[PDB]
């Protein structure tokens, strides 16, 4: 019967309404309830035929299902919108978000739930606001749609409409007597969303409706966000609000210059110099009652500059690009603070620009400052540590020395972030457990890249001791990936993913240096994964025994010398010699096998399947366990 359901779903999705009616013709009531109620999966999309018919705009199919077959409008399922799939969307929601006005009218006129709540609390009105269809918004609100219904994160239709470029939708919402002071979960009161994308007309409309200015959660005014996003025109409009005072004007102009100093889309150093000059002149306008800048002490990351407390020194750095970049970064740090989310991005961008200009030391200083600031705020830095590994790899591939204190600092930060990643993974059950586990594995890979790069750099005894202390700290928490891989195993395994960028040149796995360092730092060499393979079991499965034979020989010597059993068995009860799959590895391991009577006895007991429980020492019960 499910084949008929698939036929019905395909006919409804493909627009063949006549074939759909022919298939649904002369059927019983239970048959048509099952056919129209079946939720088939065309991949990851769980949807009834009515939902997909409303999604793709088949208004004839919707009309046939509603007027004649009396199908319900409250069917729910998962839909593929913007590439990703989220549950909780009705057919009315799909018709609203896909711009199908005729299907919206057909569903509403037949009694669809206009105020249906998604699992993310997304109303079809919010869907039409996101799509920007003003006519659909008018029809929905005129059919008793509640504007005040926000999402899970308290993002109303007004907030997203302000964020989006559809000024007609937000202007209609505010003309319909909406809430001007709509607080969000993050504290953005519907003015930051408009003054983040540079929509001057939407900000004008809200100021006409007197949306009022209030500090958000991050300690920023909407003017502050407008200055951060380099959008100068909304900064001007917010300065012309007639209730701003002077100090806000100086700090807003300075922040605008700082944002223009380092950004991807907006990068014009002449704008930075002119805006900072205007800020300094406005600051030193009264002559008396001079508003001297309070300056944070100089930070080694941005060189050693101490801002520009005078217009003369600001003039002196007019022609120097990097001095102006450092000045913009410093004033941005002073204004937005060290705890702001957006303060880190220009630092990383300036570091990347320095890296492209083959200036690595200042790049490392800037990125270390950015990593410290982001770790103080306790956010995801796996991409950042990957960037550190990539730039270290490019330095090594270019035969440029890497500073040992920087390696120690980034390694300690990676260890700490792996610890909080473990805490997050333990805390998060199933909300974003896939993303959390992917971050965990990525962090482990980045740490191994950093260790491999540290092996290729000569370091002082103190710095080498600190690096080894950090590696020791990471081992004594025993990180594990999805398939039980201990941190030793990933350095052992050839299947460890390597980033496609310059990290292929330097960090190639397996790497004997990494294994020697990890065993010297106290790695548990007898640790086994979920599948039961030890480090030795993985290393004998290496498929390139001769191209890097020195690497294989050194790692097998290190593994045997650490104390790994050359006789233990995985979950499938296979000797590493039996899993050698290579004559070279078999010869090497037989050369390094140190046979003992205990090993032979335990192997014979396991092969004979004698009941060993409660007849042997408990410590030897483990020995029977792996032998």
């Amino acid at each position: 019967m499910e084949g008929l359901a698939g036929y019905v779903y395909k006919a409804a999705s493909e627009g063949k309404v006549l074939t759909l009616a022919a298939l649904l013709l002369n059927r019983s009531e239970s048959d048509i309830r099952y056919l129209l109620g079946y939720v088939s999966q065309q991949g990851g999309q769980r949807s009834t035929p009515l939902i997909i018919a409303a999604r793709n705009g088949h208004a004839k199919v919707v009309r046939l299902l509603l007027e004649h077959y009396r199908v319900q409008t409250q069917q729910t399922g998962t839909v593929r919108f913007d590439g990703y799939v989220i549950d909780g969307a009705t057919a009315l929601w799909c018709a609203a978000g896909a711009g199908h006005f005729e299907v919206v009218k057909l569903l509403v006129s037949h009694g669809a739930n206009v105020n249906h709540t998604t699992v993310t609390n997304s109303t079809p009105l919010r869907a039409a606001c996101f799509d920007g269809r003003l006519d659909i918004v008018k029809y929905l609100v005129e059919n008793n749609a509640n504007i005040s219904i926000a999402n899970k994160y308290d993002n109303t239709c007004l907030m997203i409409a302000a964020y989006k470029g559809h000024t007609d939708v937000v202007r209609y919402l505010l003309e319909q007597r909406a809430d001007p002071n709509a607080k969000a979960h993050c504290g953005a009161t519907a003015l930051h969303f408009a003054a983040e994308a540079g929509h001057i007309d939407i900000v004008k409309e809200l100021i006409k409706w007197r949306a009022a200015i209030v500090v958000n959660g991050h300690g920023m005014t909407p003017l502050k966000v407008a200055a951060e996003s380099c959008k100068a025109d909304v900064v001007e409009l917010l300065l012309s609000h007639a209730d701003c005072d002077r100090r806000s004007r100086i700090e807003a102009l300075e922040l605008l210059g700082a944002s223009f100093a380092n950004d991807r889309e907006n990068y014009d150093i002449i704008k930075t110099y002119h805006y900072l000059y205007l800020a300094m002149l406005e600051r030193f306008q009264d002559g008396d009652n001079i508003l001297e800048k309070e300056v944070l002490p100089p930070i080694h990351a941005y060189g050693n500059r101490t801002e520009c407390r005078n217009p003369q020194e600001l003039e002196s750095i007019r022609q120097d690009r990097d001095a102006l970049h450092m000045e913009g970064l410093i004033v941005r740090e002073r204004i937005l603070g060290a705890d702001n989310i957006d303060v880190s991005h220009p630092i990383i961008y300036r570091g990347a620009v320095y890296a492209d200009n083959m200036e690595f030391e200042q790049c490392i200083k800037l990125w270390l400052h950015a990593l410290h600031l982001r770790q103080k705020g306790n956010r995801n830095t796996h991409k950042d540590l990957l960037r550190f590994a990539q730039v270290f790899s490019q330095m090594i591939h270019l035969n440029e020395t890497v500073k040992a204190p920087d390696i120690e600092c980034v390694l300690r930060c990676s260890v700490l972030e792996i610890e909080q990643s473990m805490n997050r993974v333990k805390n998060i059950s199933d909300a974003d457990v896939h993303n959390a586990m992917d971050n965990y594995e990525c962090n482990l890979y980045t740490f191994l890249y950093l260790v491999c790069i540290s092996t290729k750099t000569q370091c002082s005894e103190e710095d080498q001791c600190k690096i080894n202390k950090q590696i020791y700290n990471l081992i004594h928490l025993d990180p594990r990936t999805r398939e039980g891989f201990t941190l030793l195993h990933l350095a052992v395994n050839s299947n460890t993913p390597v980033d496609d960028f310059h990290t292929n040149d330097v960090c190639s796995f397996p790497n004997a240096l990494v294994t020697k360092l990890l065993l010297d730092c106290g790695a548990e060499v007898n640790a086994v994964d979920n599948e039961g393979n030890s480090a030795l079991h993985i290393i004998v499965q290496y498929n390139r025994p001769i191209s890097d034979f020195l690497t294989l020989h050194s790692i097998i010597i290190s593994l045997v010398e650490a104390g790994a059993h050359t006789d233990m068995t995985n979950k499938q009860n296979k000797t590493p010699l039996d899993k050698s799959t290579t004559g070279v590895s078999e010869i090497l391991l037989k050369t390094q096998m140190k046979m003992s009577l205990k090993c032979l006895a335990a192997r014979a007991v396991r092969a004979n399947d004698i009941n060993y429980q409660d007849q042997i020492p408990r410590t030897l019960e483990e020995f029977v366990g792996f032998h």
Partner: peptide, 21 residues
């Protein structure tokens, strides 16, 4: 690829911007 950080959108993805927010 290079070194260019794709975090300018991440600084703007902290606001609830999505199909639902």
């Amino acid at each position: 690829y290079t070194f260019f950080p794709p975090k300018k959108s991440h600084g703007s993805c902290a606001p609830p911007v999505s199909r639902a927010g």
